[PDB]
């Protein structure tokens, strides 16, 4: 019952330790601090306050279980689908990269492939959310759709979406037709989306910058200054640095922020091999994602050296700054 192990939030700490203990803090406020630390190691914080434990807030107690379980459903990580780099075949790499971006951003329907994915407004509308554009949900409807209430009502939503975006305009999207989502023209398809992702990244730069787009120099400078707190590795030198083995140092920087549950027995010295690099590519991504990083890059950057993507990690790092 609630008064047994829930009024004190006793079970939640064991749950948090299961998905990462905690109950040993012996005091409600110390336990809540432990909960915040566990959240720092898990990323599930959306609404947590000390009243959940100190005052035993039943609304908070009943609400936070969703954050605990939905984010960690038996650790069924969708990236372990991407570990099959071509889990589907025939799609171009660029499309795969955009798909990954949407996957990282938590769009509620799951990704399958770019041609089937985004055949509806709901997708692009979720995108519109991430760009903070307001949405008239009253004009937004349902997905299953019967013979009555068919693709035509879908079309209502679809062209609605094209009025959207062109509301603040500037995205040069005039050529896009409101009926073409059903049509699915390939270049039209890619056109309407790539700029979106670019815009988002621009937003990221502005967000982590000092009121403007962040510059390359301050990136590595802050990284190294943080690295100075953990300088077992020398530094990061350039975005064009071929010695991608330095990825281990990215993880060490992570360790600097939080040493929790990392595998440095998995970690190997600078004389790495390509298999180690493949291992690293996914492992680092996983760690970052679980910490809370909205990782936009594909793991291949650890073997392909793409300067344009690496900033993804440093973003969340600066956020922790």
């Amino acid at each position: 019952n609630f008064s047994a192990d829930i009024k004190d939030s006793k079970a939640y700490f064991h749950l948090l330790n299961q998905i990462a203990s905690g109950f040993n803090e012996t005091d409600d406020l110390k336990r809540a601090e432990s909960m915040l630390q566990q959240a720092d190691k898990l990323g599930c914080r959306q609404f947590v306050t000390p009243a959940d434990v100190v005052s035993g807030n039943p609304k908070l107690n009943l609400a936070f279980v969703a954050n605990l379980f939905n984010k960690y459903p038996a650790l069924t990580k969708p990236e372990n689908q991407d570990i099959d780099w071509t889990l589907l075949e025939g799609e171009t790499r660029e499309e795969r990269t955009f798909r990954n971006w949407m996957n990282s951003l938590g769009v509620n329907p799951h990704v399958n492939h770019l041609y089937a994915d985004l055949q509806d407004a709901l997708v692009i509308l979720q995108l519109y959310e991430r760009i903070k554009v307001p949405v008239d949900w009253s004009k937004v409807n349902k997905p299953p759709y019967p013979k009555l209430g068919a693709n035509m009502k879908k079309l209502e939503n679809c062209n609605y979406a094209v009025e959207l975006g062109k509301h603040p305009a500037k995205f040069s999207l005039v050529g896009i037709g409101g009926q073409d989502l059903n049509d699915g023209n390939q270049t039209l398809t890619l056109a309407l989306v790539w700029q979106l992702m670019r815009r988002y990244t621009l937003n990221v730069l502005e967000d982590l910058g000092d009121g403007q787009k962040a510059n390359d120099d301050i990136i590595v400078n802050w990284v190294n200054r943080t690295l100075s707190e953990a300088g077992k590795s020398t530094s990061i030198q350039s975005f064009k640095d071929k010695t991608i083995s330095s990825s281990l140092a990215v993880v060490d920087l992570i360790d600097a922020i939080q040493p929790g549950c990392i595998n440095y027995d998995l970690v190997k010295s600078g004389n790495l091999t390509e298999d180690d690099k493949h291992n690293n590519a996914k492992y680092a991504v996983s760690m970052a994602r679980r910490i809370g990083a909205r990782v936009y890059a594909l793991p291949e950057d650890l073997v392909e050296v793409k300067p344009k993507m690496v900033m993804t990690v440093f973003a969340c790092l600066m956020g922790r700054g």
């Binding site: 079309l155 209502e156 062209n159 040069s172 005039v174 050529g175 037709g177 409101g178 009926q179 023209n185 270049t187 039209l188 890619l190 056109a191 790539w194 700029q195 670019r198």
Partner: protein, 370 residues
């Protein structure tokens, strides 16, 4: 970063990035507007169709080419085309790349100036450059001396170069190219009762021309051959399932290239124009010109064209000269190819027109820098 090569022909749009061996996007240079009554709600929202979508749905649209005889006649639609190519076909931000553009010779200068203004003010590109198309063709060939015969959809022009230098006084241009041949084919298709009148039918007949026409080596012999036997007849299936048959027009159309009076034109044939251009040059370089005759453009893709030109110019030569025709398979893109080459050069990077320069000298700067 990387420069952009856009070859804005009269008939086809050719574009891509520097350093590549082929253009990434090739599509017709047309704009289509609906020509009938929209009746289903939501469907009629689209006023314009630009690239290959215009061709597919041509059945309900009126087709306009923004370029005729290589002069941009509709400037708003040209903007539509450039927007389309930048954002849709290549999907890049023009503010981040220098761009290379092409032009035919003997053109009105304001055409050049306006395209400059557009690039710098609508797209505000970092830098740009405009080049003559035949020059790029030569660049595509790896040679430094020769006369280039260029024939795309709207203009035919000849340019000679010796050791990297052109000779402008001998430059000759003929407003006679593929589109006119198409119109003439329309004209003569009625003789068998085949009628095509609309802009959409024009594409059908252009396809017809591109698939069934050829260059005879002897016009009178082939005319007699057709007059005697049907061995030259060939058949074509129209989009609705109708099949038509031609065997005489398959060559009467390209002959206009050597007989412009067919369409009432007074100008001389391509062989003769080439020859006269050669005769306007120094007697000392003509021999080298005779050995390097370079052709480019889709209208230069007819079967037998190289041999016919070989024979004709041999007939015009002092007979002690050697006549050599150069006709690579990639003729269709030699312009864009030479452009990619040129733009990829480290030395060219100082030849770009920068926005700063434009901001002071206005659009006129192009006449100085190009």
């Amino acid at each position: 970063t990387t420069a952009l090569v856009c070859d804005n022909g009269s008939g086809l749009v050719k574009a891509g990035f520097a350093g590549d061996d082929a253009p990434r996007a090739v599509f017709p240079s047309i704009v289509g507007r609906p020509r009938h009554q929209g009746v289903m709600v939501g469907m009629g929202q689209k006023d314009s169709y630009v690239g290959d979508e215009a061709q597919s749905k041509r059945g309900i649209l009126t087709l306009k080419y923004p370029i005729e005889h290589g002069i941009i006649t509709n400037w708003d639609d040209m903007e539509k085309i450039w927007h389309h190519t930048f954002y849709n076909e290549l999907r890049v931000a023009p503010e981040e790349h220098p761009t290379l553009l092409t032009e035919a010779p003997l053109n009105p200068k304001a055409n050049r100036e306006k395209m400059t203004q557009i690039m710098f003010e609508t797209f505000n590109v970092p830098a740009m450059y405009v080049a003559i198309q035949a020059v790029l063709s030569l660049y595509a060939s790896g040679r430094t001396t020769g006369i280039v015969l260029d024939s795309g959809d709207g203009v035919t022009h000849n340019v000679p170069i010796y050791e990297g230098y052109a000779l402008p006084h001998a430059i000759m241009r003929l407003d006679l190219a593929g589109r006119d041949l198409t119109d003439y084919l329309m004209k003569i298709l009625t003789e068998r009762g085949y009628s095509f009148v609309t802009t959409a039918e024009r594409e059908i007949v252009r396809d017809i021309k591109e698939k069934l026409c050829y260059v005879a080596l002897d016009f009178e012999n082939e005319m007699a051959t057709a007059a005697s036997s049907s061995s030259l007849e060939k058949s074509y299936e129209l989009p609705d399932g109708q099949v038509i048959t031609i065997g005489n027009e398959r060559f009467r159309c390209p002959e206009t290239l050597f007989q412009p009076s067919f369409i009432g034109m007074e100008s001389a044939g391509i062989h003769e124009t080439t020859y006269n251009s050669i005769m306007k040059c120094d007697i000392d370089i003509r021999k080298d010109l005779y050995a390097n005759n370079v052709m480019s453009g889709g209208t230069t893709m007819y079967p037998g064209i190289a041999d016919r030109m070989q024979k004709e110019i041999t007939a015009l030569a002092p007979s002690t000269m050697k006549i050599k025709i150069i006709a690579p398979p990639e003729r269709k893109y030699s312009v864009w190819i030479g452009g990619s080459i040129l733009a990829s050069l480290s030395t060219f990077q100082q030849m770009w027109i920068t926005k700063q320069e434009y901001d002071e000298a206005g659009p006129s700067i192009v006449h100085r820098k190009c």
